[PDB]
Coordinates of C-alpha atoms in Angstrom, one line a residue:
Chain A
X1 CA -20.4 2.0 -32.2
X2 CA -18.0 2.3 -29.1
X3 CA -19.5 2.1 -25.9
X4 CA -22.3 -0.5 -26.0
X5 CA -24.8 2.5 -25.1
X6 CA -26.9 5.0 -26.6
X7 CA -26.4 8.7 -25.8
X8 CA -28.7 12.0 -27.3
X9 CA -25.2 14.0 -27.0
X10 CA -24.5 14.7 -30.8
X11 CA -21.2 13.5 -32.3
X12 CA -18.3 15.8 -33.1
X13 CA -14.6 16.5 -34.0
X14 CA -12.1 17.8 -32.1
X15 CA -10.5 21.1 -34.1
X16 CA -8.8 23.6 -31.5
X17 CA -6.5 22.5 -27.9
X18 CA -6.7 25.9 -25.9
X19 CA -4.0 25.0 -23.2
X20 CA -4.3 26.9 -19.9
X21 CA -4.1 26.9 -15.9
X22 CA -6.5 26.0 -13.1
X23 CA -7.7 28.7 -11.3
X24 CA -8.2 27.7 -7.5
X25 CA -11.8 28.6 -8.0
X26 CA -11.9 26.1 -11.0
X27 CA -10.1 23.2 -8.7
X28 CA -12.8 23.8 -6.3
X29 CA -15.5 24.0 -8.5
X30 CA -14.8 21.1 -10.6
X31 CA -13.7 18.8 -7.4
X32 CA -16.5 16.6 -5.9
X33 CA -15.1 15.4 -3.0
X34 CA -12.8 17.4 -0.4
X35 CA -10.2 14.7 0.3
X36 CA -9.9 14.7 3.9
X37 CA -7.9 11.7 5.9
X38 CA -4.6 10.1 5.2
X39 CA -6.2 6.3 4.5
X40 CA -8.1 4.4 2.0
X41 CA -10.2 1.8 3.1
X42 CA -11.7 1.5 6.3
X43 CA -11.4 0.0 9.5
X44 CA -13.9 -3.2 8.8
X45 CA -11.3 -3.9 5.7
X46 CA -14.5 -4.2 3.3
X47 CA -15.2 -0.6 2.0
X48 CA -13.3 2.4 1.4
X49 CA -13.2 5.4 4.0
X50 CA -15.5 8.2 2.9
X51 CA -13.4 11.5 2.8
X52 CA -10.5 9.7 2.0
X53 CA -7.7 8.8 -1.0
X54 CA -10.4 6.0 -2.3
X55 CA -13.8 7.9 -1.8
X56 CA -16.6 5.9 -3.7
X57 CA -17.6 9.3 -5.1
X58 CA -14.4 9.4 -7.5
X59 CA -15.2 6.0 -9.3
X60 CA -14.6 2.4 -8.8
X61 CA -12.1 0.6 -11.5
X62 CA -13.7 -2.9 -10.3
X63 CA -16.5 -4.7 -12.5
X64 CA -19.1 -5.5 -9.8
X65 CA -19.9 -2.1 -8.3
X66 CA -20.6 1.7 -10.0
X67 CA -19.7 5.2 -9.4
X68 CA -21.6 6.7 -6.7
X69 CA -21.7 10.0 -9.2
X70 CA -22.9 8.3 -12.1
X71 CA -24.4 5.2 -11.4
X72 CA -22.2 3.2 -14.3
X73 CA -19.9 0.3 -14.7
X74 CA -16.1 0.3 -14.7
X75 CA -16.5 0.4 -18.7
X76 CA -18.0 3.5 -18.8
X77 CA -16.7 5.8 -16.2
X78 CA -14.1 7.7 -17.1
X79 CA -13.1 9.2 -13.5
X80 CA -14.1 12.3 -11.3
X81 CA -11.4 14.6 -9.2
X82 CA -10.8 15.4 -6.2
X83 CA -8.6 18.0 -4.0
X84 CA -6.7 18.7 -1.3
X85 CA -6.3 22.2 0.7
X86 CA -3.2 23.6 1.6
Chain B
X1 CA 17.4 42.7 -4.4
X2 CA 19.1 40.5 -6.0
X3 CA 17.7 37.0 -6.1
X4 CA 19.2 33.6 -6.2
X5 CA 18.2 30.1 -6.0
X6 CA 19.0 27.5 -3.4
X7 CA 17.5 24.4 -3.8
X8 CA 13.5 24.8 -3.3
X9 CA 14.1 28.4 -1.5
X10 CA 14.6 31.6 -3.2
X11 CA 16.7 34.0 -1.6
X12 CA 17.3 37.7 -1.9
X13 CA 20.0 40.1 -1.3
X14 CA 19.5 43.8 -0.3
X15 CA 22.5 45.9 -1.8
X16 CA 21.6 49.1 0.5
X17 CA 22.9 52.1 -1.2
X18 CA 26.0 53.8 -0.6
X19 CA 24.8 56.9 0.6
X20 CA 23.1 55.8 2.8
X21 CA 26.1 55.3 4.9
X22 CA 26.2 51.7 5.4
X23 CA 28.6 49.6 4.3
X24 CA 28.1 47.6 1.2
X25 CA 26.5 44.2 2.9
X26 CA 23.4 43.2 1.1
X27 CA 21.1 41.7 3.8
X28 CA 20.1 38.0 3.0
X29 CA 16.3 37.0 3.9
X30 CA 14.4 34.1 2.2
X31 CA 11.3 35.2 0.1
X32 CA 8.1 34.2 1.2
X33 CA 5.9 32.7 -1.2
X34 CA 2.6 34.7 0.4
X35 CA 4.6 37.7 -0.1
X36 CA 5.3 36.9 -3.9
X37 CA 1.8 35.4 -4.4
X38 CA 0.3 38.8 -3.0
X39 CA 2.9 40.8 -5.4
X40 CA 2.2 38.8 -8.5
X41 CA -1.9 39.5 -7.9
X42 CA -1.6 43.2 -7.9
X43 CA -0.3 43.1 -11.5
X44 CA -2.7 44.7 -14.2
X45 CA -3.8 44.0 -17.8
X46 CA -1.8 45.8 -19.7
X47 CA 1.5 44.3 -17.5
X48 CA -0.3 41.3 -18.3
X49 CA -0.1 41.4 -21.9
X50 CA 3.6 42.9 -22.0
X51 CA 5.2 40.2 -20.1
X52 CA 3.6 37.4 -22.2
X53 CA 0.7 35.6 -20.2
X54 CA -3.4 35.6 -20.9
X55 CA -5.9 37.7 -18.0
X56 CA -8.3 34.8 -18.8
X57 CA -6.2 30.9 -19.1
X58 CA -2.5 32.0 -18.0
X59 CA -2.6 34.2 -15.1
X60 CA 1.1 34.0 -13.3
X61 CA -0.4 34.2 -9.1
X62 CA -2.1 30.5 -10.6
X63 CA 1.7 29.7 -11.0
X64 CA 1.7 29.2 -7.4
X65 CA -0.1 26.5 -5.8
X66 CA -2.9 26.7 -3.1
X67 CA -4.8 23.6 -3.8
X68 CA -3.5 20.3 -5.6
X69 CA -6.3 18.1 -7.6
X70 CA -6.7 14.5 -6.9
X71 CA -6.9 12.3 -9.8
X72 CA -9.3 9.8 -9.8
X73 CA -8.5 5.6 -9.3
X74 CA -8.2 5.1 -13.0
X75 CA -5.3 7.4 -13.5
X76 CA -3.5 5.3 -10.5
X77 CA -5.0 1.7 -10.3
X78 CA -4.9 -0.9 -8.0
X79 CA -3.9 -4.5 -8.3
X80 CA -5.6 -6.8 -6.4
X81 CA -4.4 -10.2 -6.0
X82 CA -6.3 -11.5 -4.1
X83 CA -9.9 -10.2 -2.1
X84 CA -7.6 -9.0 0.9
X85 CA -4.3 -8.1 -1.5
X86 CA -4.5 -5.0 -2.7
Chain C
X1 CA -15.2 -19.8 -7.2
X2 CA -13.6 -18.5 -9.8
X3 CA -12.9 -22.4 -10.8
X4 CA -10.8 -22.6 -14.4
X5 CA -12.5 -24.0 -17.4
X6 CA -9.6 -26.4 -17.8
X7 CA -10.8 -30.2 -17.3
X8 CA -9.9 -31.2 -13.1
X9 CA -11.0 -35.0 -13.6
X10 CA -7.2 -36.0 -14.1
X11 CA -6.6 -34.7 -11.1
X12 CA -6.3 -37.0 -8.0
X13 CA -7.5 -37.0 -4.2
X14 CA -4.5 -35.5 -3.5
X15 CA -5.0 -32.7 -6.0
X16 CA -1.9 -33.6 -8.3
X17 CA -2.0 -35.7 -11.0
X18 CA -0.3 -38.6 -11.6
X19 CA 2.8 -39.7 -14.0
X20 CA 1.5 -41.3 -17.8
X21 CA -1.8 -38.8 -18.4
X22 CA -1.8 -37.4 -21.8
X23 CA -2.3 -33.5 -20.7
X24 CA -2.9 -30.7 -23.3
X25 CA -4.1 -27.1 -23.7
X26 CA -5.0 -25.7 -20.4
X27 CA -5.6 -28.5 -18.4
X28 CA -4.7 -27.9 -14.5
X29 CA -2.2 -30.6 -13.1
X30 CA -1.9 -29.2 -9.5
X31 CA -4.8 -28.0 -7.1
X32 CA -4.8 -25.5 -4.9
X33 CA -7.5 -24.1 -2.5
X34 CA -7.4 -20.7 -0.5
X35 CA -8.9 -20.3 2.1
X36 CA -10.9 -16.7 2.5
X37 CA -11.7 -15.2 5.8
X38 CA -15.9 -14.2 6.1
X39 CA -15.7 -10.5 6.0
X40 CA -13.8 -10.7 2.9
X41 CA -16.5 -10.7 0.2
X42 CA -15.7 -10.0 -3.7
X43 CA -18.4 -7.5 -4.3
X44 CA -21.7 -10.1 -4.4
X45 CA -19.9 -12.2 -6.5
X46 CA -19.2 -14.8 -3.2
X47 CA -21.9 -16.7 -2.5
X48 CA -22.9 -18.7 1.3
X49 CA -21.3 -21.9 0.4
Chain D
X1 CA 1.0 -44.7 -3.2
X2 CA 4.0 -43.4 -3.4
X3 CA 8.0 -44.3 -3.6
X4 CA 11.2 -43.5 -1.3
X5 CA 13.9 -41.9 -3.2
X6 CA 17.4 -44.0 -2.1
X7 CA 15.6 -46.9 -1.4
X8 CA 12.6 -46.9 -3.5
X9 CA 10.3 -48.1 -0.7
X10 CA 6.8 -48.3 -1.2
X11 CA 4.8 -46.5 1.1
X12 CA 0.9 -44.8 1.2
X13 CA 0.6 -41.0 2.6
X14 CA -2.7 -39.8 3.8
X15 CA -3.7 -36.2 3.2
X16 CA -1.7 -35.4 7.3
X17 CA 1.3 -37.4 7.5
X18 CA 4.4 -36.6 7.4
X19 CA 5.9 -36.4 4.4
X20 CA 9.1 -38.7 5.0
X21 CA 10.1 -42.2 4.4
X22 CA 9.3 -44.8 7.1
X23 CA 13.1 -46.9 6.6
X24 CA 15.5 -44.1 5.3
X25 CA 13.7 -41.1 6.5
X26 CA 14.3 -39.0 3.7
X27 CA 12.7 -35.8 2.8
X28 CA 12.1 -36.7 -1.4
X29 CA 9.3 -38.7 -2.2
X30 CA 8.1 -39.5 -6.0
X31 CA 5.2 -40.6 -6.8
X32 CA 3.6 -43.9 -8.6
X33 CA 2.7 -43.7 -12.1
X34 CA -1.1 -44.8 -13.1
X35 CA -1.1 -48.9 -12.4
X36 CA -4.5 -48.8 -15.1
X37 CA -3.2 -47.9 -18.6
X38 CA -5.2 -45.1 -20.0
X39 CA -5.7 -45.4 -23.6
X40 CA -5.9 -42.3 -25.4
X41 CA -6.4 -40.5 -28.6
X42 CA -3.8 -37.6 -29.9
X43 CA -6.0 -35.0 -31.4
Chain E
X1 CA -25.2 -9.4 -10.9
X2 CA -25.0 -10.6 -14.9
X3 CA -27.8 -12.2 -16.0
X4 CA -29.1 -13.2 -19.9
X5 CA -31.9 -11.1 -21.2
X6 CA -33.4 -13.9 -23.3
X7 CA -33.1 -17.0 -21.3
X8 CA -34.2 -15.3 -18.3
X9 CA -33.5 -18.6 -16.1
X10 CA -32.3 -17.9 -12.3
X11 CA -29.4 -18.8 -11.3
X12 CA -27.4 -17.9 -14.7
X13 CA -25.2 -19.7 -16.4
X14 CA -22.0 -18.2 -17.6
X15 CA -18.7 -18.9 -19.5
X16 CA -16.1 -16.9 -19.5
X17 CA -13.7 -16.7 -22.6
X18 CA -10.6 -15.4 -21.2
X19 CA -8.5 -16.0 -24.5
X20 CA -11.3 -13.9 -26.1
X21 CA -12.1 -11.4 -23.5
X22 CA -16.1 -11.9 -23.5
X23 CA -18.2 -13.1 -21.1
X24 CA -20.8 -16.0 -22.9
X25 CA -23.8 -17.5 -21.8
X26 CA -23.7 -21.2 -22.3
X27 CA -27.2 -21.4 -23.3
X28 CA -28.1 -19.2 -26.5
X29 CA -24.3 -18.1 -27.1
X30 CA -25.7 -14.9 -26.2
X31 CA -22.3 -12.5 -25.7
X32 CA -22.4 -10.5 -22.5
X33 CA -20.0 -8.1 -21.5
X34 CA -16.8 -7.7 -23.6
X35 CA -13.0 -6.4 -22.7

């Protein structure tokens, strides 16, 4: 009863860790949001740039807004990544 | 050659032969890391088993970054003091 | 907003309270306001006034 | 209401003034304690 | 926006418990978001 949800994903047990590397296709794959500028949060001081370090499509850790991605409080996000081209 | 390692930089040393009629000066150059990169992705299967890594989790040319992931805001929050501290 | 649950009547116009008041658990004895520019807003929770 | 510190003059501040006293001009001022006792109850 | 689900009365009326971590309504008790 964690959560304070309901979910049709069926419950299991974790029984095998495969460790690994990231391909660069699996970076890019996985990655929703192409970080792009050097700054946060934008010029009016309100929101977040778009594109940058704190893109709304990553998640939000405050408890009046929700994920862009997901549509779900701070309690129940758990965080989406991002990446940056060399 | 013979390489060596100087601080992030690894450096190699041609030891020319001596008939070739050169004196014995090994010619220093700094690798470059495209040149590795490109060497380590014409390695095969079998190479690939013998030296110890996987063809499908532990390739060694994804030793050798060309794209860094983001982590999302949970994994590095921010304290807000105040509505304009952060 | 965000105004404490502890008990501000003890305080006085000058928003400090006053020697000889029996205080106790989490009871406020100094007040003290912010100011907040307009454009800062805390997600919907601000309100007009 | 309040009370000078070396001298122990009374004086009343409003919520601008300077916060000195008027005769010594010092820089410490205490305050008055509550001229209507207050009974209470110790729970 | 938080707003009870039985009481249904606009504007809401709500208590936090810090000490607890919960957030009340101070109407049925009802116990809103937690943690």
């Amino acid at each position: 009863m964690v959560g304070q949800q309901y979910s049709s994903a069926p419950l299991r047990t974790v029984k095998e860790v495969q460790f690994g590397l990231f391909s660069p296709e699996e970076v890019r794959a996985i990655s929703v949001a192409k970080i792009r500028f050097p700054e946060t949060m934008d010029e009016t001081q309100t929101r977040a740039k778009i594109g940058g370090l704190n893109d709304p499509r990553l998640g939000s850790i405050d408890r009046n807004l929700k994920c862009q991605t997901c549509q779900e409080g701070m309690n129940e996000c758990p965080g989406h990544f991002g990446h940056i081209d060399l | 050659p013979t390489i060596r390692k100087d601080g992030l930089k690894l450096v190699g040393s041609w030891k020319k032969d001596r008939a070739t009629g050169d004196a014995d000066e090994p010619e220093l150059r700094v690798l470059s890391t495209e040149e590795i990169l490109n060497i380590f992705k014409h390695i095969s299967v079998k190479d690939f088993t013998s030296l110890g890594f996987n063809e499908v989790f532990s390739r060694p040319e994804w030793m050798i970054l060309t794209c860094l992931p983001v982590p999302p805001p949970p994994v590095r929050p921010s304290i807000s003091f105040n509505e304009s501290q952060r | 907003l965000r105004m404490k649950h502890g008990t501000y009547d003890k305080l006085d116009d000058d928003g400090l309270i006053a020697p000889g008041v029996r205080v106790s658990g989490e009871d406020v004895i100094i007040g003290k306001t912010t100011p907040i520019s307009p454009d800062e807003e805390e997600l919907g929770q601000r309100t007009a006034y | 209401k309040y009370i000078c510190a070396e001298c122990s003059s009374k004086l009343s501040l409003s919520r601008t003034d300077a916060v000195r006293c008027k005769d010594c001009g010092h820089r410490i001022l205490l305050k008055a304690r509550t001229k209507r006792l207050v009974q209470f109850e110790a729970r | 926006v938080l707003t009870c689900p039985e009481c249904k009365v606009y504007p809401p009326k709500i208590v936090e418990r810090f000490s607890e971590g919960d957030v009340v309504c101070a109407l049925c008790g009802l116990v809103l978001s937690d943690k």
